[PDB]
């Protein structure tokens, strides 16, 4: 709640800015490494998010190509960073582990 939470939060906000994907207009979940669980979750995204996600990634690849970056104004502010993919991925993991528990019996 107090100084303590803000400190961790500000340590997190610091790394975020240092990680620097926001400079390419990206979002945390856009940088997630695609594995089986991730592929399925990407698959389950509804039309809108999936479309936005592809354009974001395209904007970035395009930048990373000419090794430019976005104007400061358009970086993605921490806070404002939507974990759109998270709930889907969590459910995909939660599903797999169920098969995995079933496979032990």
């Amino acid at each position: 709640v107090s100084a303590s939470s803000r400190w961790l939060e500000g340590i997190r906000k610091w790394y975020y800015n240092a990680a620097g994907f926001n400079k390419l207009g990206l979002m945390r979940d856009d940088t997630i490494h695609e594995n089986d669980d991730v592929k399925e979750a990407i698959r389950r995204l509804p039309e809108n998010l999936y479309d936005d996600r592809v354009f974001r990634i395209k904007r970035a690849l395009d930048l990373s190509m000419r090794q430019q970056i976005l104007p400061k104004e358009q970086w993605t502010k921490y806070e404002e960073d939507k974990s759109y993919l998270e709930p889907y991925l969590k459910e995909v993991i939660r599903e797999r582990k169920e098969r995995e528990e079933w496979a032990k019996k």
């Binding site: 698959r43 389950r44 509804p46 599903e95 169920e98 098969r99 079933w102």
Partner: protein, 423 residues
């Protein structure tokens, strides 16, 4: 020397739900949840919704994922099936008696906590096409679906199968809505075989108290008439000719039921001449070679269709239909015996008794009765009911078919199949 049997126990909860159980001390158990959610409840904006629904009995629920429903049930060697008619959907579950609790839970989940997840629903749409293709490979199905679309302008005209233009288009929100407004306490009945009344009633009062749908077993089937024709080339022409008859449970319905056996329904003997079949003898006389004929009798909550069904060579359609019709006409004109109505009676009664010999059939009769009549009628009184059909009632049923507006569906090479106009 078997033990003396139990009596079925029946209970109407004040919220509308019905519960019925029989303790046949069977090694297996049959639990079924019957709902007035059949195809007649779809409307022109959501056709096929109850088909897709019928096919999604194992998508994930709250408290049971798809994988769990499947694995859980097969682990005990259980079954989950959903069966539909234009009026009801009937989710039945079966397993050995030591496992009813796990199967009951799953049942409750499929019927009361379905999640219809976008991606599971999308993955399931193509099954409509497979499911429909497999059914429609019997000529009868297209025919009876056309029969009904031609006979009614409403509700009962809907088909058991999704229209092609709707395949791929039914939405999860439509599935949610169909369940919410049809799977409610007042439109539901819970039948138990091999379980006990207190367990059923306990389950009912705990999990089946849901109300917020609609009310009656009707938008109300308007009977219309008219006919539908499907050119085909199948060598055999399939045709059905019908008129509005009687609503199920009404006394006129048993007259039709008996008329059906006077005229003739299925065969009783492997490869027989069908001697006691008025229709089959009457067509025989004027037709020499491949054909079948049967009286047809469908009865619903607020209507019914009665007539006959013919299968004949493309060139004999006219003759087979015409002769078959003339033979009903004959019974309408009063030319019906007494040992005839009697034989019909004995074929009906025995047929019924035989129909509820197994569990699968007993539970379905009980389930549908509960849903159509809100009661349970024992075999002895159904027999009494058939017994009260009088010769004139059968004659009147026949009379009603002859003079009533017709409905015909036919498929095959129709070049010699009469129009109605010409019957």
């Amino acid at each position: 020397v078997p033990p003396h049997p139990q009596d079925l126990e029946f209970t109407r909860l004040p919220n509308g739900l019905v519960i019925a159980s029989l303790e046949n001390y069977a090694p297996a158990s049959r639990i079924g949840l019957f709902i007035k959610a059949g195809s007649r409840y779809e409307n022109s904006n959501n056709l096929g919704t109850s088909h897709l629904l019928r096919l999604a009995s194992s998508l994930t629920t709250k408290g049971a994922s798809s994988f769990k429903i499947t694995r859980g049930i097969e682990a005990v060697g259980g079954k989950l099936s959903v069966t539909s008619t234009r009026e009801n959907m009937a989710y039945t579950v079966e397993c050995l008696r030591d496992d009813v609790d796990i199967l009951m839970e799953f049942l409750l989940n499929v019927t009361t906590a379905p999640e219809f997840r976008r991606w599971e629903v999308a993955a399931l749409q193509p099954q409509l096409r497979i499911d429909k293709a497999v059914a429609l490979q019997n000529p009868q199905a297209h025919v009876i679906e056309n029969l009904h679309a031609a006979a009614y302008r409403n509700a009962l005209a809907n088909s058991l199968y999704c229209p092609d233009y709707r395949i791929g288009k039914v939405t999860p929100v439509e599935l949610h809505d169909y369940v919410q407004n049809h799977f409610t306490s007042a439109r539901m009945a819970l039948i138990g075989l091999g379980v006990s009344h207190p367990v059923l009633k306990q389950v009912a009062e705990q999990f089946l108290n849901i109300r917020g749908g609609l009310g009656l077993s009707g938008a109300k089937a308007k009977y219309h008439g008219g006919e539908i024709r499907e050119q085909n080339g199948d060598s055999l022409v399939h045709a059905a000719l019908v008129a509005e008859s009687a609503a199920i449970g009404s006394a006129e319905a048993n007259a039709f039921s008996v008329l059906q056996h006077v005229l003739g329904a299925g065969p009783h003997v492997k490869r027989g001449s069908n001697a006691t079949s008025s229709l089959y003898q009457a067509v025989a006389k004027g037709v020499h070679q491949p054909f079948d004929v049967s009286a047809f009798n469908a009865s619903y909550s607020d209507s019914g269709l009665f007539g006959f069904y013919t299968i004949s060579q493309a060139a004999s359609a006219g003759d087979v239909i015409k002769a078959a019709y003339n033979q009903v006409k004959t019974i309408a004109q009063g030319n019906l015996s007494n040992p005839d109505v009697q034989a019909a009676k004995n074929k009906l009664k025995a047929g019924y008794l035989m129909s509820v010999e197994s569990s699968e059939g007993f539970l379905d009769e009980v389930g549908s009765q509960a849903l159509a009549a809100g009661s349970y009628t024992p075999p002895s009184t159904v027999l009494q009911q058939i017994d009260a059909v009088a010769d004139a009632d059968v004659i009147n049923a026949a009379k009603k078919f002859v003079s009533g507006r017709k409905s015909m569906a036919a498929s095959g090479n129709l070049g010699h199949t009469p129009f109605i106009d010409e019957l």
